[PDB]
Amino acid sequence: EIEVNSSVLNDEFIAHRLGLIPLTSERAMSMRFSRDCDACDGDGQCEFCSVEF
Amino acid sequence: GFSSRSVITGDAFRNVNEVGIPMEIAHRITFEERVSVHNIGYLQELVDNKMCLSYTQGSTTYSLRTVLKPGQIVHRRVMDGDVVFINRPPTTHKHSLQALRVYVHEDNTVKINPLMCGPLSADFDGDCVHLFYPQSLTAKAEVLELFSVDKQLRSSHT
């Protein structure tokens, strides 16, 4: 979710670059998919399904 | 009734007389049916599932984009098992009018069996075909009876 972009690159370029950066994932076997989580709506930080950056 | 132009690709794992049709094409072309006995429940299921696009009782074309009585015209969308007929634009393709059975997919092309390249003299390097959709019932009988692949199996040139 992009608020300000004044660079010479467009937003899909930046989002596709951000999608491919590897994060540390040791929790991934213990958390659940977002199609299965009922404790939230997505759309923010919520444990077992989502992290906010 | 309707016509459609699209790029062709191949598919060797479906049947020879089958053609795959993109969903963007399929959900905007209609077939017309006259509602009467032996198809009240089968067409009622379709109108309940919002698969019939339009309607006309009598002549005043009321849209649906109503219960069924026997005697009006339902316009439903193309689904699996219908009959279209295919033609590459006949620049030299003098005898290439073929009748094929429809299945629907999600991609952007029209898929045909690779055995049907030489009856159409087409290849997969950018060629487009025209599909035509028969609306009248006697036209459906003529298309199914003269131009099917098993009917046209032995050539008439050689």
Place this chain on the structure above:
Amino acid sequence: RYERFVVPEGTKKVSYERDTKIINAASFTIEREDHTIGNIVRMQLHRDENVLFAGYQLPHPLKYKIIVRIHTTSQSSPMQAYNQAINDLDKELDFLKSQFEAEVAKFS
């Protein structure tokens, strides 16, 4: 929309169907699987001795679905051979995991 990956619909995960022309013969249809499960189940059924036919097939290479066909002798049945293959595969995977954990703890 990218959600129809591993979830099936209201169908069963596995559906059994015992064919009529040949006896001691069946075809198990498995939803949301592909070459990974089908190939090891096929090559584990060939290790069995009361199995005369074992083979798997995707009905179409763009569908996430397989069909597994077993023909057995009269000393066993298709369902026993299927379940024996699956249990043997679990015990082999457990043995492999214990060996790998031992070697990883050894290397440090």
Place this chain on the structure above:
Amino acid sequence: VDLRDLGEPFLQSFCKKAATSFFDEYGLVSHQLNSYNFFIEHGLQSVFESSGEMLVEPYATVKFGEVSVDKPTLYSDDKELVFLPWHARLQNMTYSARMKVNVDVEVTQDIPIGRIPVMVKSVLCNTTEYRKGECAFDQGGYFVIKGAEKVFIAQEQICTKRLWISNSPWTVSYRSETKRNRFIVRLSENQKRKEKVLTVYFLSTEIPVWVLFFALGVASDKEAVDLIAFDGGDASITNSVVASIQEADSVCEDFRHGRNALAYVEQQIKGTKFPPGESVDECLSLYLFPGLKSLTQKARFLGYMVKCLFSAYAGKRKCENRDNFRNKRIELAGELLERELRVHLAHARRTMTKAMQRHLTGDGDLKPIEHYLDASIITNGLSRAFSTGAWCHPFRKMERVSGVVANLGRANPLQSLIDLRRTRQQVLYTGRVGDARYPHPSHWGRLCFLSTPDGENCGLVKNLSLLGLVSTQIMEPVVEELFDSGMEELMDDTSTPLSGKHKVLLNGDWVGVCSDSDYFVADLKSRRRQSELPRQMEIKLDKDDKEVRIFTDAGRLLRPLLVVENLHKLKQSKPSKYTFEHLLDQGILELIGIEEEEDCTTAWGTKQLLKQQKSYTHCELDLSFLLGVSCAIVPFANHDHGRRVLYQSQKHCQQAIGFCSTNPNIRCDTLSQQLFYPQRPLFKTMASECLQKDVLFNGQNAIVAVNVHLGFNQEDSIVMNKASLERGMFRSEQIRSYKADVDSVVQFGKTHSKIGRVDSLDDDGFPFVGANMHSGDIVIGRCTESGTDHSVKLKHTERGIVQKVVLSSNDDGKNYATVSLRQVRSPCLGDKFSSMHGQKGVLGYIEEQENFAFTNQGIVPDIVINPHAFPSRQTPGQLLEAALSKGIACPMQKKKGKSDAYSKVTRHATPFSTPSVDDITDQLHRAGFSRSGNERVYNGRTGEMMRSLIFMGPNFYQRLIHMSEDKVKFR
């Protein structure tokens, strides 16, 4: 001095440095800019003075003085604003300059006379000096006409500075500028069985040639047949000359007596339709052979013309064919703009005189001269000819040709580059031509014989070679410096014979003779190599015709070559990277035209041809510079069939998606496409090393395997990798612009309702930046006041996110708006692709990564093609490129274990000097691979080792602009 001690690699390095200096000094669009610059600096004044003065009589005379042009400016306020071409593009204006002339009328002030369009990067452009408004990828050479970019296509005409010998009635013809200058000598029967006689068609009047001989001043028949100089024998020639004598005597009674023949040509000229306003003596001094002084010289030139006809008759001379390019001149912007401006200047003067002639009858009451001359005639005529394409006919009056002005394409920078380097032979009915559609051997080095269209314009439209130059007119006099090399005068006695001497001809005009011709030519060429003769001067020695021809006119095609005898002057020099001027000034290089090259032995580029045997006078810089700019960069281009090279270099490289621009914020094109990550190839041709440009290539380096894939790549289909596409291979951005205009009633506004679908619109009638517009929405709201509006709606397949909204206005009161929509596409299942060897195809299947067949390092393909495509298309170079590229991206395993492991790596694949297959396979063997180019692979679905070895390697692939979702239609 031997050239062996200079060495071959030194000479290759010098050839690369010299071509690099050429491209630094000239560029690729010098032939447009030089022609426009010559028209502005010289040709404009020549038009306005050659037009002449005039006097209206019902007296009042007018005279045109000198002409001035000033830079393009804007008078929006009463300030003078600088006018740049991007202002002209965005405001839908024409980018033009004002012309002023100062008149002198007597029965004196400066009057504005019109606006002439300005070529970008010329001497009138305001961008000549990371400026605001410029792209880095751009050179000049185009025009901005009503907001649109246009280019000139060069027009080919026949050379009229020579004689032309036909054979349909056996004609020989002299042409010139004036239509009253045409001179024809015909050999025919004007009637039994008459002997063939000689006739003159001068000023639309058939005259016997013997009468014209005695009219010009000859005294005897023996000195007249000395002027013809039969070379003896040939009884048909003697029969024709005695028949022409006794036919001359059968028309005038004793024409040989004083002024009888001259009185005869008086009464023969004067009786025609529209006789000239002159006596015959001034008619001869005006319209007979302009450039010669005495009537003695005109008699000598007529004898030379008759000798040429009789030599063609006997089979000792050939007839001229118009496919040999030594008989052709090429017309660019100056030659076309002069011809166009003469028409509308005459139309201005004609409606000036019939406007002055009323008020002059009407007492002085004469106005200032700015009233009697309308300036919009020239201004409207030039812009109408630019915006419609209809130029003027070269020689027909009142006619209009059509293939002159084209549109500039901006799909990639290579399409713009090759749209500026074209040449055309226009023909009457397209479909019945001679050898016009074919390569002639006089195209060598100057036009590409591999790349051409394939539609109706096949062969009729040509492309310039890489080192090709179009000459320009030399303004200094050159005839007085010819005497210093051993040329003598042409005397006036018509009684002295000139046997053994060679004739010299300067632009077709006979100006002298020379005794020794193999010293005259070799001294002129030596004085040209030391910069005291002009560099664009063509000298041709002709042994059979006994003739020396010299050309200094515009429109000749030149190219540079090494001069072998001056080639030893490099050793003693210093190998700092040269200028082209310094190599020209030392005689190492020369510019050579088509006719001079017929006297040249040129070694074939290869220094190994030059230095193994020295029987040569020149040598090429490289053989691949024989091809055009899109054909010289193709790897192994002499290894493929010619239809495939034509497909790649004329069609597929103009449709590739790559680079677009470096300043997209001021480009409101209809379509703009661009890759996310453009790459360059792995191989290095000579032209790509010399131009140093990356925007010649538009595509990606995909790893290709040659294998069957479940029957999904038959009939020229391809299979792609899903995971390579998700990581951004062949990912494309696309921007489309939607434009609308109003007068400054209909206006821009919110339309106050949802008749279409209005969600993102503001009060002004345009959406916000970043809106997500859908098919069926309203992109531009033109609310007609109090309703009944005409808005612009997106069609059934037009989507996107709003990138910018631009609002512009005009100078004549008109408002424009442009809205741009951004889309991002990865390849779908009917998108079109092609390699660099003409193997086009469609994407037919997208496969998962773990289903692909893999190598012992885990490399999977990105693209899989069918092996049935190779034995049938005749493109073997695609296998040799992939085997070369794999050898240059692999690590050298260091079996030797030395320092310079990567020193002897082969990476060029230049056309006509490709590496041999032993070098490519030795490079693959040093990298640890099989020489045949294939490798063992494991099956991806089952894990088994596959029985067949598979050819794999990187190929440069291109994503073309034909996409599947744009071809879907339903009626």
Place this chain on the structure above:
Amino acid sequence: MIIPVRCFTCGKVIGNKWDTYLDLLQADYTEGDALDAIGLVRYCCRRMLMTHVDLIEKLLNYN
């Protein structure tokens, strides 16, 4: 415009290796030796760095 985060074919992280490769080229290395010292072994990963065109610098000037 900028170097891609991962190799197209295999998926190895290469997006933090461009300035190091330019620094090694600036100290008079061959391209093969500049890729050897930086850890790239498969030719699919090496052709990502040998063939990259760095268009971001030209985009930064022309606005």
Place this chain on the structure above:
Amino acid sequence: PVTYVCGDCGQENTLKSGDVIQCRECGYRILYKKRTRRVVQYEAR
């Protein structure tokens, strides 16, 4: 607040009517619509 900028200098005009399309501080006739403040959501795919 729909405001425009000048593509030559950068002066932020505020057009609300339909008189002409022109700057004040330059006199040139090219203006851009300014990007206001709002959040747009994308997939990182």
Place this chain on the structure above:
Amino acid sequence: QELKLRAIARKGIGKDHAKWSPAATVTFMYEPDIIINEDMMDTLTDDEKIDLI
């Protein structure tokens, strides 16, 4: 110029998009068995052995 954004990171697998794959390259190879018949190896002179190797 300025960049300002907020991201949501979730769990997924490489079959859905290649950004969720943890392997830059996983592969195996068959182990080979090589026999050289030494009774036919003596028949070769050593420059022919170098030519073979």
Place this chain on the structure above:
RNA sequence: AAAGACCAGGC
């Protein structure tokens, strides 16, 4: 509206 003119894809 109607024709010209251009370009592309096929045959």
Place this chain on the structure above:
DNA sequence: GTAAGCTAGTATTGACGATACTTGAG
């Protein structure tokens, strides 16, 4: 009213079928 200033006045890339005219002589 534009006929396409007057514009040449034959004086330069097309080339065949298809129809229509000014001879001698039975």
Place this chain on the structure above:
DNA sequence: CTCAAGTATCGTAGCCTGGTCATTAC
């Protein structure tokens, strides 16, 4: 007093679909 004929012209000569522009005011 008409056939043939030797020119004398006429007129079509690749064709079809797409997308596009730019269209004299007097």
